[PDB]
Amino acid sequence: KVFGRCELAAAMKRHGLDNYRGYSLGNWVCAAKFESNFNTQATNRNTDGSTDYGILQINSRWWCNDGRTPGSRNLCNIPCSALLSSDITASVNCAKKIVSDGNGMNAWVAWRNRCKGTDVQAWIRGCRL
Structure with a gap:
């Protein structure tokens, strides 16, 4: 999807991402802008032999499980592909763990x-708030 x-800010918000670890929708919307061009099905291979998934482009190196990243952890307890859904609950919930991981939005x-x-804020502009 x-x-x-504006219909990304929204899902983000109902999904508790709004000012999470002090990062406003604006942050989370711009972040998804550049990471997936707001497409839930954006996967991208690293030179790592790692792959980033979905909406907020979750790395397969520690955050989720896909089957082919020799080294990896599944710190979010979820199949990498559950990050690709139309519904952003997985990737949001994943998101939450990552940003909580010391380094803030810098992980992205x-x-x-x-x-x-x-x-x-320019990102959530006009958005029915």
Whole structure:
């Protein structure tokens, strides 16, 4: 599913991501912007031989289980593909664990890189709040 900007903020919010570990929807929406171009089915292979999944692009190195990342952990207790669903509960719930993992949104490289310190609210603009 390719989410809308505003119908992504929304799901995020009903899914408790809104100002989680102090990161506003703005952060989480921009983050999903650059990570998946708001598509729940974006998977991307690393040189790692790791693969990132879904919406917030969850790495298969420690966060989820797919079957072929020799080293990996499944710190979120879930099949990598459950991150690809139309419903964002898995990836949100995963998200929650990661951001909780010391380093904040920094765990998301395009977030550090493309959204960090930027007018992130711009992302939830006009959104029926």
